[PDB]
């Protein structure tokens, strides 16, 4: 009976500068509204690794700071309280400079 979150997404700047602190948006829903944690990708081998448990559909805004340059994927998916996992929401955040 139970399904798993629906994909999460993640809003914030897509670029920047080399050492600024910047904000990321996350959420996603539970079909059956369960509890969820994330689990993000930072794209540079940084992760949030099953934060939560936080409610269906509550936004989540969590920083991060890239100190070298590049061009990385941040990702986040979600599973709920019976663990089944979603599929990953992806921004790409450039770093040139
Ligand atoms: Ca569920």
Do not use: C, Q
Request: avoid cysteine; hydrophobic fraction near 30%.
């Amino acid at each position: 009976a139970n399904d798993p979150p629906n994909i999460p997404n993640v809003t914030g700047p897509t670029n920047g500068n080399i050492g600024t602190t910047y904000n990321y948006t996350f959420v996603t829903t539970d079909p059956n509204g369960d509890n969820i944690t994330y689990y993000i990708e930072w794209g540079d081998g940084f992760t949030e690794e099953w934060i939560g448990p936080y409610a269906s559909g509550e936004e989540v805004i969590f920083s991060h700071t890239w100190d070298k340059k590049g061009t990385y994927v941040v990702r986040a998916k979600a599973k709920d309280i019976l663990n089944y996992e979603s599929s990953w929401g992806t921004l790409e955040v450039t770093m040139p400079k």
